[PDB]
Design an enzyme around this catalytic site. Structure first.
Site, PDB file in Angstrom:
ATOM      1  N   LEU A   1      15.029   1.401  22.023  1.00  0.00           N
ATOM      2  CA  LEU A   1      15.238   0.504  20.887  1.00  0.00           C
ATOM      3  C   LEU A   1      13.862   0.167  20.288  1.00  0.00           C
ATOM      4  CD1 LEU A   1      17.784  -1.060  19.590  1.00  0.00           C
ATOM      5  CD2 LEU A   1      17.090  -3.024  21.005  1.00  0.00           C
TER       6      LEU A   1
ATOM      7  N   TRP B   1       0.892  -1.186   0.000  1.00  0.00           N
ATOM      8  CA  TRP B   1       0.000   0.000   0.000  1.00  0.00           C
ATOM      9  C   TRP B   1       0.939   1.249   0.000  1.00  0.00           C
ATOM     10  CZ3 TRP B   1      -0.173  -3.559   4.173  1.00  0.00           C
ATOM     11  CH2 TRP B   1       0.682  -3.219   5.227  1.00  0.00           C
TER      12      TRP B   1
END
Ligand SMILES: COc1cc(Cc2c[nH+]c(N)nc2N)cc(OCCC[C@@H](CCC(=O)[O-])C(=O)[O-])c1Br
EC number: 1.5.1.3
Length: 162
Positions: free
Chosen positions: A94, A21
């Site tokens: 992270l 998409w």
């Protein structure tokens, strides 16, 4: 550690080395959910970004190619080198941004899920990895409606139970 991703209804994430998409609202939230953090990507997902590196974050690129060159990114070869980098910087969070071979390699150490869920169904060839959704609570859910109705999407924050 968080997983950053966007899926269709069935859990599809990728087609032919690119996105299935084009969703601009979700890629503006990809920018600023990772402005400032240590962003981890597999080597294929790094090469398919239009700008290489994408700025303002640490890009860490996981590759088995000893010689691989990415100027301005942190090029490492195994998961124990990602965590040995994340230990050096205790103030940057992270974020594992994919694809599917990297989301397998940090499956055990995720604590949060930053999912975008598209209401439609797209053709491709890569899915999200299977996860124990029963081990996580949905904390926050925000829907965005798009004038293509397959592109109407919910942003969902999940956090792992004690
Ligand atoms: C390979 O195709 C992509 C896949 C992603 C993957 C992805 C997208 N969205 C989400 N939520 N999760 C993901 N894992 C990101 C991406 O670029 C993020 C681009 C950030 C840009 C701004 C983009 C924009 O103008 O929307 C920047 O300069 O920081 C691209 Br291109």
């Amino acid at each position: 550690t968080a997983f950053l991703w966007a899926q269709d209804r069935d859990g599809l994430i990728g087609k032919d080395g690119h996105l299935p998409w084009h969703l601009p609202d979700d890629l503006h939230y990809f920018r600023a959910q990772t402005v400032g953090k240590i962003m981890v990507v597999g080597r294929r997902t790094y090469e398919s970004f239009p700008k290489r590196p994408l700025p303002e974050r640490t890009n860490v690129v996981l590759t088995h190619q000893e010689d691989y060159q990415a100027q301005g990114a942190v090029v490492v070869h195994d998961v124990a080198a990602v965590f040995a980098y994340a230990k050096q910087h205790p103030d940057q969070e992270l974020v594992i941004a994919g694809g599917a071979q990297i989301f397998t390699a940090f499956k055990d150490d995720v604590d949060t899920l930053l999912v975008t869920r598209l209401a439609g169904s797209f053709e491709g060839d890569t899915k999200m990895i299977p996860l124990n959704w029963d081990d996580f609570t949905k904390v926050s859910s925000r829907t965005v409606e798009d004038t293509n109705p397959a592109l109407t999407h919910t942003y969902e924050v999940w956090q792992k139970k004690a």
